[PDB]
């Protein structure tokens, strides 16, 4: 197989700001098809409050619908933290995190599903702490590129929380059941080499090379078939998500079927008020 | 167990219009907590175009976030059709249904997921045809109340489409594998009695009684525990949706854990920069 | 719009393709139906290893004949569809072959469908039963069991209470009982059995063969884990190959150049 | 099975010594019967009741003369009304005499599930709430014409989102399961039969007579085949826990073969095993 | 996150004997909440006979119901073996291991289920051989701490047995399918480093420090929320055990619901013979 | 307790069974190993529909030969194991074209055949295992890799994908993070990289590839064939839902037939009596 030149992979990146209207995040797009979502609350180690999550959902929705975007990067502002999870300062007694109107949210669950069902690869670019809900977020991303200063772990049993959804089951599909139980039960911190050794991240690079390397990985994907990528992502989800995974995988099959003459004949016949004739389309074995 | 007040179930219903801004649907709310989404394209048997689906998504999102709403009804305008599925007149060659900007969508998949993950019961109120994607929509709703004039079925293999996601697997969890294969492979139409006999709808009533009966069922649910309902809906999805189902079910467990003193101690300790003391909370077996 | 009943109930012209077979008949109609008939009425159409080998061969032929769109499985005579394994484990291979067949398979049942013969009708996508049809398992009565698709898939048809009843007691069930529990798709008078079955086949023969195979795979996928994903994804690959985007990948490789996927717009 | 055998008289030997909340009885032809005996509270279970039911079911499992177990309630008015609400504490469960909070019916559910002998629910009158989940968990349900079924969770501030939800759906389908749980209606015996929730409905006066007939039909059959099929049917629901049961039965069968035994013998005789004598099947 | 002091983690441990009545095992409890079950048949490399398993089941049940116990350690007596599986000297022809009365048991399957469903973490403390059924036992434990002399492997295909239950499927969820097939098909032995590298154990420590390090890990968990731990254990089981896993996870959710005012209102209304009133409890989104 | 190394590393005697095959070689050892070798080195051992048909035929023979206990799959030469579907014959109409113009995806049949084979199948990989050829080594129960082996997928680059066992089952081997990397980027991985991620069972010098593979086969050949087939089914059952249950339960039925209780139906028939199951003591 022929491969892309490293010179192109390491070409300069031109980012354009698309952050207007956002208070808690930055949102940027490169000319060559990368969207970057940056949590921008470094004073609280990039913890998310409900507003933060709402903005991330809005940005990811925009990235999904922009046909010039092929890959999304999720990251945190600064070098100290990717994300430290839900903002404990606004965590209420009544079953969620409080917004300024007093409504209690667990809206990161919506963002998790949105990352999961996104037909474009999402890459976590991790510098410093990826902890708690912030650790589940990196796990949800298809790939994780980690700096050598990255630190990983959960804190639920120490802070009176837990993610028993994708935070548990999907973690096990990454690091295996023994390591998943250790990570959750003891709530230790793991350095970048430890994370790499257990298969929790895809690669570790020096912090100075983090963005350069991440952009390289994104560009490798951008050279590939977007249709193939979305089908494979759905197929990999389908090993985990039961009928919800089937919904994604089968939905892509329908999309492909619509592009065939056989599928189109069914539509055409209905619009033309006649019976379809599928006899011209030979049956494969 | 004491029973609901029968006279109360049949009290008059006061609807308020919330349709401002919508072109393809109506959206209404009752004073006692029912939201009603009505597809309003009877000239095409209430077939949905991408705009229709976008509007339904917006209304369901509003219903989810309105804490005064406890149950949602999905229905079609007029008595002739609930929904005839995707609008074939705008179905493009390029893998989806075309909006006025020429973008190709399969956004009913998003709407399916939104119904699935909605923590409030969604009730399909079916008069006349529920066909194709419109049949999958009634199936996705938690309950279906059918008029005696209701007609059910798929048309995919006749019209050059298929829903191999929840439209297939989840149908089988309702009517069984033999009936599911019949429904999909032959694309016949089934009357209301046939649908009831196979467990495809919850009840059949005369058309004249359809809204009255639907409102009664909604009111029975509205007097019950909203927390129990959302946990049970998640638990029933979890028999189908693998890790995506675990995400919903465990997420509700987290919400409940946040309401306990043990959970709150973890938050409090973190905010107060001290170690938590969980020893006061006795271990159940 | 639906096909005319005059067409659905038109006469059927069968051609024999049974050369070489000792235990079965194999026939094909002009309009795309293949029919496999277990032909051992003297033993209530029980299968022996040769029978199973022949059925596999016939079904393999039907799969590869692009003129065939639907397969009927049935027994010779009016007394039995199949009474299972011969009294005096390759049927598992035959079960798998029915499951993975990209064409609909219809069980046409007159009289007894019992034991391994009962699991066979269940494996078929649809079952059309005559009013004299009788259904049930016998394993626990004779010291056997089918704990594979014979158990789990049975439960996906009739539900868990009835599956346990059917297996634990080994009663016989008449056609009405089977219909009521969702075990068969329809019941018709014995004299009309083939006539109605052919109608059902012809209704499917009017529909998209690609859609049918995708849906069959999708329904299998609710049951068969990664093996089901293999079928469903495999059809997706087949479709992808028919697209310009897929073909560009092939063309680029053969032309020893990098592919350019940029003309193929990203759908949301 | 002819009628003389299926409808032979029904006689019981009492084995209830030591129990406060249940009766436990055995027949000569291989049936054990566990009867919840708290009719004054519609046969609601308190933690002691569940502990006793577990003890009785364990006894039935280990008694090689027993092939089938019947679960039922005393009197004609109730099978079981679920957890005893009078002793339900604030701290996450039902309180015993020590003040410990239990949800021990979950242990009893798992024990019915993994029991290698068929368990049959014999239902007269109310099977409601946790009592309804109990009939669903039994392999078969025989209902009297006076039987009434339903859940009450969303009305009583509880839910069974385990086998009470998912397994119900495998019986009545997802539409009916959501109706049963969300509305908390009661369903009569005819309604239950029509939706497939029970296996048969019989006149109340004939309830035990018919239940015992069903038991006797199973008792004529292979106990090993039954336990393998029960495991196989659980395996369609219970993932690896189901695989544990099904494969466990395969191990038991393998131990009974000469091939399996050669391995043991070789180890005990401190030599290499020789499996060459045993032909490889396709 | 603040972590416990190492001085506390490595403080001496004081054990109290609770072995009265046991013939094949020891059972001990520490003042700070650890229960330890020790197989005591070193003359047969700590192989279990049916009595051994019955005793282990009794001890584990005691640990589950003792509200002062938060973590359980499973181990073997001496330094040479953790457990060598079923006692082949008492394995009968008739489908199981014989007790002194001649009844044939496979009761370790009950013990596997009991470890699985135990709401407290169970830790395998492994010195020397963990082989056959004894290897499955370490795998079933939530975590495994191994001494540098530990040896791991299966022997089924060599001794005429197999564990195709959790011994196969769950092994694959720990070490992956390639290694699971290697381990089972060839029946080799693996040293502690090999086991660590494939993710089969959580850590490897010097033999002299085995209990010291194990007690440290236990104490780290004892500082954490017992409710969070049991929910996460159930959640991780749920990725494997289908509806049986849902029973555990949902059961914990019910327990939490019982602790809420909303749940309690339902109980109260029933006990007071009145309609429940759930209107005071706001619906979260 | 364990076998002798002298026996494990003894010479191997192969006899040819390739008569009739155009695209593969097929050989059997005296001690119970069958070896299927793809023989199209000029296309890096890429398979066309005929190649797959022949491999299916050979594997069926090995399955049915009771003298065979283990099967090796490998490629001819040292440069390639298999490079996947032959792109030179890949048609527009949904598959790879044979000489008659029929479009096939018959490697899917071969995948299922390897999966359901009751004997262990071992991938012996020298050089490239790429694309459909990479899925094939993954499907094999074990993979022994030479130090020159190269692994990877190319789907998104060549306009294809295997979203069946090629995706889900890969994830059960290397985990979800690495599976997504392997598929999304289509890089190549060397033998060390593959070993480190758990994609292969061992890496050995190329000169020793067959010697070590035969040793692994011989270690399995000394073990119980029944236990091995039950375990293979049990391990498939963690992945394949009801299809996996079919295999596992089918083995249970076979075992049951070997017991007196299982035989009671046959015996009753021959003795002209009704079966009596009351006589068999119930285990708990
Ligand atoms: C390991 C650190 C990330 C960094 O340590 P470091 O020593 O560098 O800094 P530190 O001094 O702790 O923190 C700096 C400042 O940031 C703040 N901060 C850090 N993390 C958070 C945070 N998560 N929330 C609020 N404030 C935070 C600190 O309070 C402090 O600010 P200050 O009070 O001085 O003004 C540490 O800050 C830490 O342990 N943070 C807490 C992590 C944590 O427990 N997160 C919540 C876990 S649970 C969760 O995320 C979550 C969310 C949504 C869920 C939805 C459904 C189901 C489950 C969910 C869930 O589990
Ligand atoms: C429909 C009945 C069964 C019968 O109606 P009926 O009108 O004939 O009789 P009733 O007058 O209500 O009852 C007669 C007496 O029995 C008592 N009783 C009936 N059921 C219960 C009961 N369940 N608990 C305590 N007392 C009960 C009544 O209080 C009353 O006693 P009294 O005041 O005269 O002294 C009715 O009594 C009734 O609705 N009972 C309550 C049903 C109920 O809500 N059960 C609890 C559901 S939740 C549950 O069971 C459960 C248990 C364990 C779980 C574990 C893990 C996860 C979930 C769990 C779970 O959801
Ligand atoms: C059985 C009816 C519902 C009613 O018959 P009736 O005789 O009463 O009325 P009819 O005369 O046919 O229709 C009245 C008018 O409505 C129009 N109409 C009805 N349904 C549709 C429709 N679905 N699309 C466009 N026009 C429709 C007719 O064209 C006609 O309008 P006109 O031509 O006079 O201007 C019939 O109209 C009918 O078969 N309609 C087509 C149903 C159909 O095939 N729908 C699409 C199935 S597939 C689909 O929905 C779908 C959508 C999204 C998906 C996303 C992911 C994966 C799969 C998806 C999917 O499969
Ligand atoms: C590698 C060793 C663990 C240690 O080697 P070492 O060289 O240090 O010691 P060794 O000389 O072999 O043994 C010392 C003494 O202990 C005895 N011993 C060791 N293991 C066992 C043992 N498992 N049973 C009985 N005796 C044993 C030896 O016989 C010997 O006793 P002695 O002759 O002096 O009186 C070796 O002893 C050994 O391979 N033992 C056998 C391991 C084995 O095959 N276990 C059974 C596997 S299958 C299993 O466990 C099992 C159980 C329940 C199941 C239930 C359901 C489904 C499956 C199940 C299952 O697969
Ligand atoms: C990395 C190599 C294996 C070796 O590189 P190398 O540099 O050593 O050699 P190269 O010069 O590229 O190749 C040598 C010769 O072999 C040929 N060749 C190698 N592989 C293939 C090949 N796969 N098809 C056709 N020709 C091939 C080359 O064209 C060339 O021949 P020539 O033109 O000079 O006559 C490279 O040749 C390569 O990338 N080959 C293509 C691999 C490839 O994309 N395979 C198809 C992936 S998709 C697939 O396998 C597949 C199959 C069935 C499926 C069924 C259901 C669902 C999915 C399926 C599926 O995805
Ligand atoms: Cl920055
Ligand atoms: Cl956390
Ligand atoms: Cl009109
Ligand atoms: Cl449709
Ligand atoms: Cl069903
Ligand atoms: Cl309830
Ligand atoms: Cl073993
Ligand atoms: Cl590929």
Numbering used by the authors:
A (entry chain F), B (entry chain A), E (entry chain E): 1 to 285
C (entry chain D): 2 to 89, 106 to 285
D (entry chain C): 4 to 285
F (entry chain B): 2 to 285
What does the paper say about this structure?
1, 4-Dihydroxy-2-naphthoyl-CoA (DHNA-CoA) synthase, also called MenB, is responsible for conversion of o-succinylbenzoyl-CoA to DHNA-CoA in the biosynthesis of both vitamin K1 and K2. It catalyzes a multiple-step intramolecular Claisen condensation reaction involving two high energy oxyanion intermediates and two keto-enol tautomerizations in the formation of a naphthenoid ring. The first crystal structure of DHNA-CoA synthase from Mycobacterium tuberculosis shows that it forms two eclipsed trimers organized in a homologous hexameric assembly, in which each monomer is comprised of an N-terminal spiral core domain and a C-terminal helical domain conforming to a canonical crotonase fold.
There are two hexamers in an asymmetric unit of the ecMenB: HNA-CoA complex structure with their three-fold axes tilted with each other at an angle of <5°, similar to the arrangement of two hexamers in the asymmetric unit of the crystal of Mycobacterium tuberculosis MenB in complex with acetoacetyl-CoA. The other structural change is a significant reorientation of the C-terminal helix (called C-helix, residues 260–272) of the opposing subunit by an angle of ∼15° towards the enzyme active site. These structural effects of the ligand binding are best demonstrated by comparing the structure of the unliganded subunit (chain D) with its opposing, liganded subunit (chain B) across the trimer-trimer interface in the second hexamer. The unliganded subunit has a disordered A-loop and its C-helix is bent towards the active site of the opposing subunit with the small molecule ligand. In contrast, the liganded subunit contains the ordered A-loop and its C-helix is not bent towards the empty active site of the unliganded subunit. These structural differences between the two opposing subunits provide unambiguous evidence that the observed conformational changes are induced by binding of the small molecule ligand. The conserved active-site residues in ecMenB: HNA-CoA take the same positions and orientations as those in the previously reported ecMenB: OSB-NCoA structure, despite the obvious structural difference in the small molecule ligands.
